[PDB]
Write a protein that binds this ligand. Structure first.
Ligand SMILES: Nc1ccn([C@@H]2O[C@H](COP(=O)(O)O)[C@@H](O)[C@H]2O)c(=O)n1
Ligand SMILES: Nc1ccn([C@@H]2O[C@H](COP(=O)(O)O)[C@@H](O)[C@H]2O)c(=O)n1
Ligand SMILES: Nc1ccn([C@@H]2O[C@H](COP(=O)(O)O)[C@@H](O)[C@H]2O)c(=O)n1
Ligand SMILES: C[C@@]1(CO)OP(=O)(O)OP(=O)(O)OC[C@H]1O
Ligand SMILES: C[C@@]1(CO)OP(=O)(O)OP(=O)(O)OC[C@H]1O
Ligand SMILES: C[C@@]1(CO)OP(=O)(O)OP(=O)(O)OC[C@H]1O
Ligand SMILES: [Zn+2]
Ligand SMILES: [Zn+2]
Ligand SMILES: [Zn+2]
Lengths: 155, 155, 155
């Protein structure tokens, strides 16, 4: 068994919606990023790659490479997962923590779990997503962006 | 074995003391929250619920429900633990990291461990709590609030 | 198997270079701290100590004790590791996440892995280090300091 941890942040910019955990969530502002800016899946990806000792998302899918512009972070998740499985690992379970003042993530979590469980080829019970605000404190509390943390356990 | 991760933040407000890890710690200011605002136990709770794929603290004990006003976060911890055990899990070990410029947490950690070990029904050796400041940087460094992170391993 | 988590922050100050994961990295500014201020190894140390239920870095190597001034964080890592092994644990794997806007950590990661794997007496495959920026948001985004998170799995 191997443990992994990921952390990611994206700033708000433009018109909504935002894509979090693969779900299109309505919001006043959108998120700025090379890909679709899915903070949750990026953090999740780093956790899995980390547990596999494969590095991180930027190393495998460079900000510079134009092939990843507007990229579906789920596509990146699946590829990172493919490579991980090739190194010989299987999923243990993953846990994600979205840190945002708004929008409300709770109603979208079930669908996020559905998408992630599909992408990782596992049972929905092997996937957990949660959210918390920083009580108006910080860049997240001031609504400047969304952060996300994740841990993974590979077998 | 399942892994879990939690993160929580509460802003200072009012007169002290603050309750962290169940311990009443003397401080100039107190913490604002629906319950007693125990940042450490909330983060710990999310870690355990996450590892159990039970969601998060807000989902089980809503900010809206007046039954949780002034609530003892230890009561919430035990209940979340009860439910977790019902899903069939046993405690592996937990690790907590309190992020605060002040007050000093170190002298209160032993008692925190005592409380948590009791609430989780485990040996004190299965529980670890630590602290760090962000070196005056950030909302924590500016003394605007306390943050806390936690990881858990269920069996 | 036991899980651990660590988090650390150090503010920029003075002339460079900075020491991260044991590597001397060229930078305009340096990092302020009692020891060499290696944010990555401190976070890693707390993760390992946490998983071992040995507390944290400050508890074992006090900011007050002048013996640790300018200290090589690798020396502190090895000692914490020595004690951990004495409690009976062996390394599972560790994962580190450096949170910095700059400098670029990627090219220095291989050497960091070499140092850490040596200090922990393991294969480089049992060690992973990654980096991410907070997209100009926060004290890290504003270049005020570097943060770092880490998780560890002991056996
Ligand atoms: N300080 C930093 C920040 C990011 N990066 C590299 O850039 C990639 C991701 O960049 P972002 O911060 O834009 O998400 C990561 O692979 C990371 O290693 C780095 O090498 N040093
Ligand atoms: N962006 C956010 C922030 C919090 N929440 C929900 O609110 C509950 C906790 O709220 P607090 O941020 O007040 O601790 C969590 O269960 C979380 O899922 C959310 O759904 N979306
Ligand atoms: N709020 C805080 C912050 C740090 N500390 C103690 O100080 C030591 C490390 O201090 P630094 O924040 O300077 O890294 C840790 O062992 C921690 O327990 C504390 O006891 N309470
Ligand atoms: C996902 C990738 C794709 O280029 O980039 P972004 O969408 O900018 O977001 P980031 O988290 O900054 O970096 C990692 C990259 O792999
Ligand atoms: C603990 C609960 C209880 O209503 O609320 P709070 O004391 O406000 O703190 P929070 O961490 O914001 O949310 C989760 C809730 O379950
Ligand atoms: C590493 C030690 C050594 O005195 O201190 P620092 O170099 O200041 O950094 P910190 O992360 O604040 O605290 C823990 C101490 O053990
Ligand atoms: Zn990202
Ligand atoms: Zn809380
Ligand atoms: Zn430090």
């Amino acid at each position: 068994m191997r443990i992994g941890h990921g952390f990611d942040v994206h700033a708000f910019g433009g018109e909504g919606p935002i894509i979090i955990g693969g779900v299109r969530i309505p919001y006043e502002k959108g998120l700025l990023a090379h890909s679709d800016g899915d903070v949750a899946l990026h953090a999740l990806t780093d956790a899995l790659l980390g547990a596999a000792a494969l590095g991180d998302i930027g190393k495998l899918f460079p900000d510079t490479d134009p092939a990843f512009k507007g990229a579906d972070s789920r596509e990146l998740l699946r590829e990172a997962w493919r490579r991980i499985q090739a190194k010989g690992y299987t999923l243990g379970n993953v846990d994600v923590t979205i840190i945002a003042q708004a929008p409300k993530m709770l109603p979208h979590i079930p669908q996020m779990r559905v998408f992630i469980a599909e992408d990782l080829g596992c049972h929905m019970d092997d996937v957990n997503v949660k959210a918390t605000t920083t009580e108006k404190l910080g860049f997240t509390g001031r609504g400047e962006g969304i952060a996300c943390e994740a841990v993974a356990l590979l077998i």
